[PDB]
Design a protein around this ligand. Structure first.
Ligand SMILES: Cc1cc2nc3c(=O)[nH]c(=O)nc-3n(C[C@H](O)[C@H](O)[C@H](O)COP(=O)(O)OP(=O)(O)OC[C@H]3O[C@@H](n4cnc5c(N)ncnc54)[C@H](O)[C@@H]3O)c2cc1C
Length: 565
């Protein structure tokens, strides 16, 4: 039961690592996956099936604690339980990050993590199919210099894509609001309006999940091994004389309930997702001693920010009704703070600036003092500067034809300041975690969401879109009158929001001295040979949809692992 590498979690990120490490025929790799293949699951393969698998056997359906700042209700936190992980149930959108927000990773002390360093790995991951003439006419575009042609992840546009009145009107309406069309949001500058591509195999007309990309075309490799329906509980350690912890292997529970062990000669890579990887660490004795001791776990490594620094987004939705049939492309708009707030920007900025130290003080308490005031002030300053000085997008706004006369919009603030945490509730590896994203904790988080909603209301009634749109239907003017105060908007947003399912930061890549959990090679502090490679390591949220960046991070991590070997 001994392998060179064990990769825990055959998901979006884990499959990349397993693929790349097994390129060396003399290296054995074991993948552990709690779920199973969805190669033949038609609700996964369905190119238009986003949403169908929600609440099914392939959705973990994690649940938050009461969201005390958001009206008190608990929230489902969805995630894929499948070979391919969350890439099997997600919305398939392929968008990246702002260059300067990846550059911040190196600024805060993560050597080698910048846009210029990550770009080659975005390229390495990707195989973009160029749009057809009909797709071009609909608005599909790309910058060849920033798209890969040979990577495992197929990317492209739907065969159903055709030009229509709605997407043309949106282009014009956003341009009139000062937000122009851009050919590609994936070259490090995201601001603009765009007919975005998807993780789609256009040759087959199926969802391109991580397993179809990185696993199945390679499953004849004799040095790559997969255990499906197999849950990793925790790591166990070599018993020696030195302080530094050396992982010996992983304890697993199989479908028949048998608990056994597998061993790693080189390293254990944890890729179980942002809502599981930190828990695996805690159960292994890597985490906050107070939490471990409450659960009768002896610390192997005192690393009290494991599970801290959880950052997620929340989304809301609006809708309109056309005079007639609405048709065309699905579109994304990434507006900056000044795009959303216009002439009130300076006042919004002044208010936010006056709040940063107070946000930090509140977050210190969330972490029971394990993130320091000074450190959080500096982290929040970096985010503030991205918003205010670099003018990174503060919102994602999707517009979709909804069939017939319907148009829907789905939107979210990209960079809320709220931080929460996730922690084990017991030493029992089956026990649900206490998950607390702290949605709506800070004024900016709700105020920006309300600003975005108000902006969308304005767009729906602006020229030339207002020639197509008869009225707003959600919330509509009955539910939220034209003269309603911001509190009415915030109350409505709180009553109707969903998690955006973009949790990051629970094993954050930062210097240990500022509260990081992993180093710049993704190695867990205090260990020799344990890495986390998944959304847990992102130290801040990004502007785009996560898989593109997670694939790139895992591609780069794979090279770092090989170099260390
Ligand atoms: C509904 C939804 C829609 C989304 N929309 C988009 C979108 O349109 N575009 C986009 O880019 N991103 C989207 N996202 C986000 C993106 O899909 C995820 O952030 C990303 O897939 C997470 O990758 P990961 O490697 O961190 O974890 P995952 O892909 O979740 O992988 C973790 C893997 O570990 C397994 N696992 C967990 N615990 C254990 C255990 N103890 N033992 C063994 N295995 C375990 C899981 O079953 C899973 O396969 C969406 C997410 C959701 C939930």
């Amino acid at each position: 039961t001994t392998y060179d590498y064990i990769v825990v979690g055959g998901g979006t990120s884990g499959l990349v690592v397993a693929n790349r490490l097994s390129e060396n025929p003399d290296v054995s790799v074991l993948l552990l996956e709690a779920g199973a293949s969805v190669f033949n699951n038609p609700d996964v393969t369905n190119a238009n099936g986003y949403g169908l698998a929600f609440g099914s056997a392939i959705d973990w359906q994690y649940q938050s604690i009461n969201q005390s700042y958001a009206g008190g209700k608990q929230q489902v936190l969805r995630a894929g339980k499948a070979l391919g992980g969350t890439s099997t149930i997600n919305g398939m959108a392929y968008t990246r990050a702002e260059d300067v927000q990846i550059d911040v990773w190196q600024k805060l002390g993560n050597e080698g993590w910048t846009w210029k360093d990550l770009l080659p790995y975005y390229l390495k991951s990707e195989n973009l199919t160029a749009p057809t003439s009909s797709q071009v006419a609909a608005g599909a575009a790309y910058n060849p210099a920033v798209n890969g042609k040979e990577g495992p992840l197929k990317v492209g546009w739907s065969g159903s894509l055709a030009s229509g009145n709605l997407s043309v009107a949106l282009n014009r309406t956003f341009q009139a609001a000062g937000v122009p069309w851009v050919e590609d949001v994936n070259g490090g500058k995201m601001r603009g309006f765009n007919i975005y591509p998807s993780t789609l195999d256009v040759d087959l007309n199926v969802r391109e999940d991580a397993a179809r990309a990185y696993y199945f075309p390679y499953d004849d490799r004799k040095n790559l091994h997969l255990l499906e329906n197999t849950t990793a509980n925790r790591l166990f350690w070599k018993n020696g004389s030195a302080e530094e912890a050396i992982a010996d292997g992983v304890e697993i529970t199989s479908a028949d309930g048998k608990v056994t062990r597998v061993h790693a000669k080189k390293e254990v890579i944890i890729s179980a997702g942002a809502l599981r990887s930190p828990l695996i660490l805690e159960l292994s004795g890597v985490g906050n001693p107070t939490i471990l001791k409450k659960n009768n776990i002896t610390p192997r490594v005192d690393l009290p920010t494991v599970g801290e620094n959880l950052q997620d987004q929340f989304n809301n939705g609006m809708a309109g009704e056309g005079y007639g049939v609405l048709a065309g492309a699905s579109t994304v708009t990434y507006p900056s703070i000044s795009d959303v707030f216009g002439n009130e920007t300076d006042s919004i900025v002044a208010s936010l600036r006056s709040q940063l130290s107070d946000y930090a003080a509140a977050t210190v308490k969330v972490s029971n003092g394990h993130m320091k005031q000074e450190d959080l002030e500096r982290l929040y300053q970096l985010q503030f500067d991205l918003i205010v000085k670099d003018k990174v997008p503060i919102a994602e706004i999707l517009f979709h034809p909804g069939g017939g006369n319907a148009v829907s919009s789905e939107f979210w603030g990209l960079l809320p300041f709220a931080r929460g945490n996730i922690h084990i509730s017991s030493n029992d590896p089956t026990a649900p975690a206490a998950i607390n994203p702290n949605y709506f904790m800070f004024e900016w988080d709700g105020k920006s969401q309300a600003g975005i909603a108000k902006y969308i209301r304005k767009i729906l009634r602006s020229a030339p879109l207002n020639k197509l749109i008869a009225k707003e239907t959600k919330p509509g003017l009955s539910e939220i009158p034209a003269t309603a105060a911001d509190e009415k908007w915030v109350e409505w947003l709180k009553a109707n929001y969903r998690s955006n399912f973009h949790p990051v930061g629970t094993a954050a890549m930062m210097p240990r001295s500022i509260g990081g959990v992993v180093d710049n090679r993704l190695r867990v502090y205090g260990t020799s040979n344990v890495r986390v490679v998944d959304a847990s390591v992102l130290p801040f949220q990004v502007c785009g949809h996560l898989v593109s960046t997670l694939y790139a991070v895992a591609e780069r991590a794979s090279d770092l692992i090989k170099e260390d070997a």
